[PDB]
Structure 1
Amino acid sequence: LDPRDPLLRLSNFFDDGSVELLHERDRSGVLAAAGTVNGVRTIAFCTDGTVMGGAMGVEGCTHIVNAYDTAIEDQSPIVGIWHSGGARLAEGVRALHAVGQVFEAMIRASGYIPQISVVVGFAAGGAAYGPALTDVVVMAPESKKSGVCHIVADDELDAYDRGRRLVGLFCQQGHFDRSKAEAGDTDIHALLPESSRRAYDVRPIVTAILDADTPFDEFQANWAPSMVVGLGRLSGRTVGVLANNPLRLGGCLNSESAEKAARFVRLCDAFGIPLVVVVDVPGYLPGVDQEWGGVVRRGAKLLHAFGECTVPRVTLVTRKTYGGAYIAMNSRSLNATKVFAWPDAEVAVMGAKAAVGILHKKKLAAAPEHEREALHDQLAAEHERIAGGVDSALDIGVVDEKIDPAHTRSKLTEALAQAPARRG
C-alpha cells in the first residue's frame, strides 16, 4: 500500500483493531473514522494524499464536518491527519464554501472537545489554516510559519505517538496524588547557578517538578524562547507549566513570549487543566527598533488570560520577579490561587541599585563624584535590607508562603488540590 493511504494512516494512529469507518471509502480526498486511543473513544479524519495530492473538495470537507458533528455530539476528542495542497481549484467557489464550513465546525468545537492536528505531509492554504484553528499541532519533519507548530516529532510514526499521548493528556487528566508528589520531592534549588547573576536553562527545573519518567510535552520550543510552556503530569494529573527561561533574553517577557504564554493559558483554562507558573523574570522588552506596540497589546492579552482564568494556578518565584512583569506572571492581584517563594527569592519594583538611583537621585547627584559610587552602594545595601525580601512580600500578602525547595512538588500539588476545579 502507498504510505499516503488514509486507512493506513488512520490505522497507525488508532488502537489496533479499533477502526470503524464513518462513511464509505470514496474519491473525496478524505477518510473519517471512529476508534480508540489507549481506550478512549476518539474521532479522526485523514486527508488522502493519493487523490489530487490531498486537495480539499466539497465531498471531502463534508466528511470532515460530519466527523466534527459526531465528535461534538459524543463529546469525543477529534484528531485530523493532514497532507494536502489546499482547496481544489477546479471545484471553484463551492470548494471554498465547503472549506469554510470545516472552519466553522472547528470553531463550534473550540474549547468544547479537544482538537489535535497531526501534519504528516505538505499542508498549504486551507490545509494550513485548518490545523491553525485546532488546539495542538504536531508536525512531522517530512511535512517560515513561526509559532504555528506546537510540537515537532521525529517522523510520521513518532507524530502519531505524540498525538496519542496528547489525547491522554486532555482526556485522561486523572487526579492529583499527594503520596506520589512527596515521593518525587527533590531539592530543586540545587539546579540553580551559584551566582544570582548567572543565566541558566529553566527546563531541568520544570522536569524536576514534573513526574520523573514522564515526558514534558513542551509547546513551541523554538519560538519565543524566553518563555517555556507545555503539558506534563504532576503526581499523575495533567498540568500545564509556564516558566520564564533566563537562558534567553535574560528570561524577559516580550511580544512573542506574552503571546505564547497567553494562548497557552487560555488553552489550559478551556479544558480544566491546572497551571504551575515558575517565575524568574527581571523585566520586559520591545521588538527590534524600539517598537512597544506588540508587548503592550500581547502583554494586555496575557493579563486578560490570567485575570479570567478559573482553573487552579499556582505561582512559584524561584529567584527574582520585578515590576510590570511580576504583575503579569500570575500575581495575586490577578487572583492567583497561591503564590510560593523560595527562601532567597526577590519580589520588587526593580533591582535595588536601580531603585536607589531613582529614589535618591538628588542626594546622589549632590554628592562628591569620588564619594558617590560608595554612597550608591551603601544606600542600595540599606534599601535591600528592608525591601525586596520574601518576608516583606509575605507581610504585604502578595506572597502566601515561603517554602523549602525540597518540598516544591508536594507544596505545589497541595495548593492545586485545595483549589476548586473552577473559581478565581
Structure 2
Amino acid sequence: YAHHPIDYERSTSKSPNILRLPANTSDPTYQENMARMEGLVEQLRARVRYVQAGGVVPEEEAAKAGVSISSIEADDRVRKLHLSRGKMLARDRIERLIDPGTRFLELSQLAGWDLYWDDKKKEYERCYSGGIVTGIGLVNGVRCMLVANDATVKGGTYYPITVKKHLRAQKIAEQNHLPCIYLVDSGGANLSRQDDVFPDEQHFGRIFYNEAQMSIKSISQIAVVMGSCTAGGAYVPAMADENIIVARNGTIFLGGPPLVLAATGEKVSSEELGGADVHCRISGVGDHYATDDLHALYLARRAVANLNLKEHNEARNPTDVKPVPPLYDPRELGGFIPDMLSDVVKSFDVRAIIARIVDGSRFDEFKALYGNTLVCGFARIEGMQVGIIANQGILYSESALKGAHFIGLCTQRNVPLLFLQNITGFMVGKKYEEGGIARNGARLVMAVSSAPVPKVTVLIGGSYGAGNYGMCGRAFEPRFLFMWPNARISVMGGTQAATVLTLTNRNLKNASEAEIAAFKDKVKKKYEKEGSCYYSTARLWDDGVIAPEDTRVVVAEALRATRLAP
C-alpha cells in the first residue's frame, strides 16, 4: 500500500525501530534515584583510593569512607624503610611493566576489606588489599595476567583470601590462555592460620599444580623474585619458564636462616643460604640476574616479547577500530536505578539501561509480548555481537522456555552471553506448581550449565535466592564477575524470609510487639547486613566491583579477554 522501499532507508537511517528512545525528564523521582546513586558511588570510588597507598592518606579527610582511623605514621615509616632498601613499595611495578597508552582492569580490588576480627574488639586486621593485586595487562602487544605480591607482611604473607585470589587468577589465565607474570615478595607462610591455608585442597599446593598444568598446555608463565619466597614459596622460581632474581635483595630459600641454627647451626651469610648468588655458582637456578629494579623489569618485558603471541592477538583483536558511542549519555545510568531500603519493592526498568550501554543504542528483541517478565536479545558492544539476559519481574514457566531457546541459539552460533541479575521471582501459586514449573526451571538450568559459550555476569541489584540458578551464578563457571553498589545476595527471600520465619520459631501468641522487634527486625538486620561492599569481593564472591556508569568499557575488556581462548 503506497509503500515500496528496499528494507534499508527503513534501515541504515537514523530512524530504525532497532534503536531505543527512552528519554528521561529529570523529575523528583529521577532526582531521588539519581541522587541516591550518587550516594552509592562516591565512597566506592573512594575506598579504592585509601587501600591504594594503603594506610597513608595525607588528606586525613577520608570521612566519606567509613574506614576507621589508622596509624598513618606507622605505615609511612614502614614504606620509608622499605623504599630505602632499593625496591619500589607500590603497584608501581605494574604500570612500569605495562605499555603506555594501554588499558588495565584490576580484576579483584578491595580484597580482604575488613575481613578478620582481631583480639582487640574495635580493631580489624589491616589488609588493605588481599596481599596481592591482580589485573589484566597488555605487555609488548601481548595480553597477560599480572599478579603482584604486596610487601605487606605485617599480618603474614598469605591468607585464605590471598591463595584464593591467586588461584582465581591462575584459573582465569588457563581458561583464557593469557600468560601470567608473578611479582614475588613474601614473608614465608602464616604459622597461625596454617591449618586453614596449607592442608586440604584448593590451597597452596594447587598453585604448584596449576603452574605445571599450564606448562603442559604450553602456556608460558613468568615469575619475578623481588624478595624472599620461603616455606614452599621457592618452588615458583624453580617451576618457571623464566625467573628473575634481583642482584642484592632477591632471595630464595627452602630452609630459613633461623632453621640452620638448632640443627647444625654453622650459620653463614644469607647470600650463601640461597639468595642471589652472582659468583658463577654450580647452581643453574634463576634465568636472569639483574642489577636494578628497572633492569629486572626490562628483562621481564624482553622475555615476554619472544613468545610470538603478538601476531595472534593482533589478528584476533583488531587494534585499529572506530569507537561507536551510544545515543544517550552514560551519566544517566544512575538515575533509572531506584533507591534503597524501601519497605515494598520499588519499580524498575531495563530498556533504558540496555539502550544506554549498547552501541548505537539498539536492540534485537525476541518474543517480548510473551513471557513479558524476562528480556533476551542480541546487541553490539564495541564491534562485537553480544547476547544479553536481563531480568525484570517474577519468572514464569514461559520465561524459562524463552531463556532456554535464546541460549540454544547463542550456543549454536557461538555468541557470547551477558547476564544482568535480578530478584528470584519464582511464583508459588498452586496452579503454577501443577503446571510443571519445576520441569521448565530444570529446562532452563540445564541449558545454562551446558553452554560452552563464554559467560559474564554483572549484578544489577536484588540477586537473592535460588533464582540466579535460572540465569547464572558463580557455581556455573562465569569467566568474570562484577558488581554494582546496590547488591544484596541472600536466602531465597530477602523480605519474605522475615515474614515466613516469623511464624515458625518458638513464638508465643502474645507479646506480639516484642516478638516482631526480636524476630522481624533481627532477620532484616541479618539479611541486609550482607551487601555488595562486604560479603562480596572481600571474600571473592563475585570478585569484581565496578561503577554502573562505566559498565560497557569493563564488559568490552572482558570480551577481548575471552577471544584468545582455543
Q: TM-score range by the shorter chain?
A: 0.5 to 0.7
Q: What TM-score does the superposition give when structure 1 sets the normalisation length?
A: 0.52
- What's the counterpart of residue 355 of structure 2? 207
- Decide which of 225, 229, 233 is 2:380's aligned counterpart: 233
Corresponding residue of 1:264? 406
TM-score normalised according to structure 2 size: 0.40
Instruction: Give the distance between the partners of 1:175 and 1:295, measured in 2 at CA.
Output: 45
Q: Distance in 2 between matches of 1:177 and 1:287?
A: 54
Larger Rg: 2
1:387 and 2:387 are equivalent in the alignment: no
What's 1:127 paired with?
none
Please say if 1:418 is aligned against 2:561: yes
Q: CA contact under 8 A between 1:174 and 1:238: conserved in structure 2? A: no
Q: Secondary structure at the match of 1:321?
A: coil
CA distance in 2, matches of 1:255, 1:422: 34
Q: CA deviation at 1:289?
A: 2.1
Map of 2:455 onto structure 1:
313
1:198 to 1:253, Cα distance in 2 relative to 1, 3 A: same
What SS is found at the alignment partner of 2:460?
Answer: strand
- Change in 2 beyond 3 A, CA 1:359/1:370: closer
Query: 1:200: Cα distance to partner?
Result: 2.0
Contact 1:210/1:232 (8 A) holds in 2: yes
Cα 1:287/1:359, change in 2 over 3 Å: closer
Higher relative contact order (CA 8 A, sep 6+): 2
Q: Does 1:332 align with 2:479?
A: no
Please give the per-residue CA displacement for 1:353-373, whole angstroms capped at 9, x wherever unaligned.
443456674255577113122
Q: Deviations over 1:305-363 (max 9, x none)?
A: 12121222211111111221122221111112222221111111134444345667425
- Where structure 1 has 5 or more consecutive residues not aligned to the other structure, the ranges are 4-8, 15-36, 39-172, 246-250
Distance 1:396 1:369 in 2: 38
> Alpha-carbon deviation of 1:267?
0.7
**1: CA distance between counterparts of 2:396 and 2:463?**
15
Q: What are the equivalent positions in structure 2 for 1:39-118 lying under 5 Å apart?
A: none
* Contact 1:312–1:421 (8 Å) recurs in 2: no
Unaligned runs of 5+ in 2: 13-315
Show the counterpart of 1:408: 551
Q: Secondary structure of the residue that 1:372 maps to in structure 2?
A: helix
- Pairs within 5 Å for 1:99-248: 180=323, 185-194=330-339, 197-211=345-359, 213-245=360-392
Range with greater deviation from structure 2 (259-268 or 282-291): 282-291
Identity rate, percent: 28
Greater mean alpha carbon deviation, residues 400-409 or residues 225-234: 400-409
Contact 1:311 1:421 in 2 (8 A): no
1:274 aligns with 2:416: yes
In the comparison of the two structures, how many residue pairs are matched?
255
In terms of fraction of residues, the more strand-rich structure is 1
1:350 is matched by which residue type in structure 2?
A: M
Counterpart of 1:207, as a letter, is: A
Distance across 2 between alignment mates of 1:176 and 1:298 = 43
Shift of residue 258 of structure 1?
Answer: 0.6
Instruction: Give the letter for the 1:394 counterpart.
Output: T
Deviations 1:23-45 (A, max 9, x none): xxxxxxxxxxxxxx99xxxxxxx
Alignment match, 1:164: none
